[PDB]
Write a protein that binds this ligand. Structure first.
Ligand SMILES: CCC[C@H](N)C(=O)O
Length: 244
């Protein structure tokens, strides 16, 4: 009851929840940075091959192929590949890299977006054509002496990020670009019929990392969200810690 005591519980739980929100944010950042560094190392190993190893398709197969496979294995990627300007892609896929001419790579955002930036491009989650699993793709236009060799692509199962986020402490969860629930420690939050407007509206009024209160079934809750890349990470708890 005493306003001194209520304030001290509010400050205390505010510190705990925002600490745990940061753990989930860091989880998403570390996932992306690990994958980007992997993709950069692979780009460098392909680009450092002699030109003779790169200028025929058969040489690409025999000299880039093993590299794609060793990298795929090292990180347990789903697919690792190099897309070429003739529309063919050298593909190293889970369950010997082959040159494929039937995957329409020039229509894929991971291909075309890599050509418009000098950075690694990261897709949202989407259904992989090759193995029919949801993936996040990291892609990168590879250049050697200013000449494009092709577009590197690395597919990581989006389930990997979901499991990483789910294992974090706290009632944390993650929205995707379309404000659709993407990951959650509490699996029940993945129910697609749940209305998330209360917590998203509270976030919209308060801003990144700013603790707020909101209502659920006429009961007070506390929470905070923050943008992480194009995701939105949130945490929420009951307000009983301050009220009881
Ligand atoms: C070989 C390209 C594979 C990529 N996951 C896609 O669906 O385009």
């Amino acid at each position: 009851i005493d306003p001194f005591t209520k304030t001290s519980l509010y400050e205390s739980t505010l510190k705990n929840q925002t600490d745990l929100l940061k753990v989930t944010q860091s989880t998403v950042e570390d996932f992306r940075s690990t994958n980007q560094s992997f993709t950069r190392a692979l780009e460098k190993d392909i680009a450092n091959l002699p030109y003779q190893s790169l200028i025929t398709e058969e040489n690409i197969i025999n000299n880039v192929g093993p590299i794609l496979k060793y990298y795929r294995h090292s990180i347990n990627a789903l697919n690792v590949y190099l897309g070429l300007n003739n529309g063919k892609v050298l593909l190293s896929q889970k369950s010997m890299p082959e040159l494929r001419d039937d995957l329409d790579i020039k229509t894929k955002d991971w291909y075309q977006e890599a050509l418009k930036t000098n950075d690694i491009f990261v897709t949202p989650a989407y259904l992989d054509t090759v193995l029919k699993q949801y993936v996040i793709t990291y892609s990168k236009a590879i250049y050697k002496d200013g000449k494009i060799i092709g577009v590197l692509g690395v597919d990581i199962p989006s389930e990997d990020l979901q499991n990483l986020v789910a294992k974090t402490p706290g009632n944390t969860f993650l929205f995707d670009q379309k404000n659709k629930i993407f990951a959650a420690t509490n699996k029940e939050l993945l129910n697609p019929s749940i209305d998330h407007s209360p917590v998203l509206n509270a976030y919209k009024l308060n801003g990144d990392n700013n603790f707020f209160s909101y209502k659920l079934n006429n009961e007070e809750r506390l929470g905070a969200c923050t943008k992480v890349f194009a995701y939105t990470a949130c945490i929420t708890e009951s307000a009983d810690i301050i009220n009881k």
